[PDB]
Design a binder for this molecule. Sequence first.
Ligand SMILES: *[C@@H]1O[C@H](CO)[C@@H](O[C@@H]2O[C@H](CO)[C@@H](O[C@@H]3O[C@H](CO[C@H]4O[C@H](CO)[C@@H](O)[C@H](O[C@H]5O[C@H](CO)[C@@H](O)[C@H](O)[C@@H]5O[C@H]5O[C@H](CO)[C@@H](O)[C@H](O)[C@@H]5O)[C@@H]4O)[C@@H](O)[C@H](O[C@H]4O[C@H](CO)[C@@H](O)[C@H](O)[C@@H]4O[C@H]4O[C@H](CO)[C@@H](O)[C@H](O)[C@@H]4O)[C@@H]3O)[C@H](O)[C@H]2NC(C)=O)[C@H](O)[C@H]1NC(C)=O
Ligand SMILES: N#Cc1ccc(Cn2c3c(c4cc(Cl)ccc42)CCN(C(=O)CCc2cnc[nH]2)C3)cc1
Ligand SMILES: [Ca+2]
Ligand SMILES: [Ca+2]
Ligand SMILES: [Cl-]
Ligand code: NA
Ligand code: NA
Ligand SMILES: [Zn+2]
Length: 806
Amino acid sequence: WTATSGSCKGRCFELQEVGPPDCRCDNLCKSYSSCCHDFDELCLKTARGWECTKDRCGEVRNEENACHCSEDCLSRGDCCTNYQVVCKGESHWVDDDCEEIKVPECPAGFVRPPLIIFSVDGFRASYMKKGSKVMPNIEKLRSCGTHAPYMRPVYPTKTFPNLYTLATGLYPESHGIVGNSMYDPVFDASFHLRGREKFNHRWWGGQPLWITATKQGVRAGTFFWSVSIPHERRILTILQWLSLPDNERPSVYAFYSEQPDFSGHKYGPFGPEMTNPLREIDKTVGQLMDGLKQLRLHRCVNVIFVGDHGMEDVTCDRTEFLSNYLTNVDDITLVPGTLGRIRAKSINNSKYDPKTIIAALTCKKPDQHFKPYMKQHLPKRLHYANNRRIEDIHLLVDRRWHVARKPLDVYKKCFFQGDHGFDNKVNSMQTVFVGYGPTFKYRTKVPPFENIELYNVMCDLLGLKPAPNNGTHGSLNHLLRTNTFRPTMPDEVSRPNYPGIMYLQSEFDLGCTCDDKVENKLEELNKRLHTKGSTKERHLLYGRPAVLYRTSYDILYHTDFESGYSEIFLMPLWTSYTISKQAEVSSIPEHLTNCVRPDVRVSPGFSQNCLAYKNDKQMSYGFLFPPYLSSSPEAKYDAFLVTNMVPMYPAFKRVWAYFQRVLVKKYASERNGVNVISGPIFDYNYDGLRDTEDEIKQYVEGSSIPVPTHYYSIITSCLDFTQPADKCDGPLSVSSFILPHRPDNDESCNSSEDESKWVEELMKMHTARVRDIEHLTGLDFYRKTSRSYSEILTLKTYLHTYESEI
Ligand SMILES: *[C@@H]1O[C@H](CO)[C@@H](O[C@@H]2O[C@H](CO)[C@@H](O[C@@H]3O[C@H](CO[C@H]4O[C@H](CO)[C@@H](O)[C@H](O[C@H]5O[C@H](CO)[C@@H](O)[C@H](O)[C@@H]5O[C@H]5O[C@H](CO)[C@@H](O)[C@H](O)[C@@H]5O)[C@@H]4O)[C@@H](O)[C@H](O[C@H]4O[C@H](CO)[C@@H](O)[C@H](O)[C@@H]4O[C@H]4O[C@H](CO)[C@@H](O)[C@H](O)[C@@H]4O)[C@@H]3O)[C@H](O)[C@H]2NC(C)=O)[C@H](O)[C@H]1NC(C)=O
Ligand SMILES: N#Cc1ccc(Cn2c3c(c4cc(Cl)ccc42)CCN(C(=O)CCc2cnc[nH]2)C3)cc1
Ligand SMILES: [Ca+2]
Ligand SMILES: [Ca+2]
Ligand SMILES: [Cl-]
Ligand code: NA
Ligand code: NA
Ligand SMILES: [Zn+2]
């Protein structure tokens, strides 16, 4: 109920919202049909259009005008944006040479450079190059300012999850907006794109930038605009806000454009119809910059031009229907489209069973265009599991495709030619970033980065302390001229023990055997030094990882690898080794086929035992440092130590063995040596964070050996690959993975073929940032390099995507 009896006179686009039933004049009132009767007449004036003309110059002010060309307009801050160009012979901002902005050039009374966020919905990264001819203002922003070739959105690459990530620096699973559409089983309520419940408040977690600004005494324009407010009026309103007195004037502003997403849905990302929407966005940017230039603010304000997601080609004819797979299709609810989420239509259905559903959806058609997942088995890089609103069963849909429940849903509910929502590493989903202003760098290109990082930077640009978030604060320091954030390394919480030889062989009753008992001061002194850490500088290139939680662990040195061995989990937290370009792959000798050796430095009570594996019919074991890469036959005995052993399902051993025997040597020759750190991950509650010991849901049968949910590796080399990994003078280069530790290979449809046809593809799917592995392990890597810490934070957020060029 809005008794829209009040008025909007003197209240047009009021920053503070009003409480029902007093009628609203804020820029969202249209959306809720709750404006004052006079809102259109007073706030959405249009008369005479949007531009000054020669004959309007120095006119007498007429309040019916959309914008003014009179003499006082600059004082009032309500000139048309082209006023000084037409009436004072100035030039359009786009026609000025650019000039480095070394310091803010702001009017008296400005306490900090304002930030204007200019967000565009559906603006695909490749539009920057492909549309460059029809977007001269944006092209000037891009070339004169700081820009990335593209920005990675979060998954799902939908509008609401991404806009709210941009505002909070949080993954959807944490801020709670996990979809454009959602169901919350605890509230028993749905969140809908269109209408009410959207706006209830309880849906939104974290702390968006506008609330962060307010709480710290920085005033915010609104970040929301009704669709019927013309773009030109949006710009004019921001320009007017910028003319307010110092005590009232906001410091952060957002403009939102429904385009080019709106047209891209209809015509596809590159439909011929796409050119005009691109020209119109550019024209709007032109208006903003001319407007700012007029107010003398065009060298004072920081401007971010940013997209939520890209846009892919998708049509009705590329739809997979679950009714082709499931006989029980009426017992399920599907959230459909460029992703799938399935739950039971009825919770009183006790015959509903996710395993049989998953099985009926698994590799059923030769070119099947989606893949089913329990959400905890989704690639960890997607961070899309830890929310009650994300259904247990997820479908990852191929780019260009849709999944639907039944044919009736498509033709009885072809319109569209574009859609988005797909995996966030898909090229067509990538979006844009350009920063322009005194606080950003001049003519600088920066590497691609993830949109979760931006909140921190927008906080830096405003002098704010960001709320706790998923960005890595400092990893975007190289975008900024000043206002950088200089974090310190976290402090090591646990210090390692360095055990020496303290146990006799016969103290071990582990059920293990090894044909090794066949043994000299040349090489007896030598081997002792290897156990003391004499080759450690070769295998621990960047320092040892710091353990960031309370635990008890040992450092174990060997000729070919160094390890940090947990006495709590009975296996290494990490194992580090270097493989040079020249390194040779050997095989496991026959006599050592099932060799496991007791480690005389670690008590039987802190060791694994072979009998548990023998008894455990589903579980086998593998090694973190691969016997295949031993430097000598003598060094190869170290690789069979019980303290290098980890629990592995036979199905996973196929993956791990191919990685260790084939891929590490391959990377070593392609990269000129690599350093590898591998280990286990335990994330049974799928929250993306290291489990404590009481969170482990599975052990090797009859023992206290915990079973990892994942195995990671971090592969580091010199960015300049003419230098060997162990002799690198400058910037590093990394790729990493977090492989699910699974009892079958159902994820890989081709897995009954040779590992050379399927393993590398599975690994690419499960690519990770080192930062992902840090959260999952409580470890902190690259402690001792000669690089700046900010540069190392950038390296740690890098994701190797294996997509071809943008
Ligand atoms: C990405 O960044 C984000 C932000 O940094 C990281 O998320 C944080 O993770 C923290 C550690 O897991 C978590 O800390 C917990 O806080 C609990 C109190 O939570 C409330 O207060 C915070 C602060 O204001 C608030 O943000 C929370 O909001 C959540 O909840 C509502 C919906 O439920 C949403 O509006 C909102 O979106 C957000 O949801 C998300 O977080 C929760 C977890 O908090 C998830 O479950 C949701 O699915 C969703 O993802 C809350 O309003 C506090 O209870 C916790 O403390 C327990 O555990 C500690 C261990 O330290 C123990 O000492 C305590 O005793 C306590 O245990 C007791 O309670 C248990 C639970 O009831 C019970 O089982 C036990 O038996 C004990 O009795 C804990 O400290 C923090 O809330 C979030 N913050 C956010 C914004 O998500 C995120 O991890 C990063 N991701 C990665 C991959 O790095
Ligand atoms: N960088 C950046 C940036 C810019 C703006 C915002 C703010 N914002 C906006 C939307 C939104 C959804 C969520 Cl879950 C959270 C925040 C969100 C929807 C579209 N938006 C509209 O203004 C149309 C409104 C409308 C559409 N139909 C009726 N009204 C903007 C957040 C980040
Ligand atoms: Ca076994
Ligand atoms: Ca966990
Ligand atoms: Cl969705
Ligand atoms: Na023996
Ligand atoms: Na398979
Ligand atoms: Zn869209």
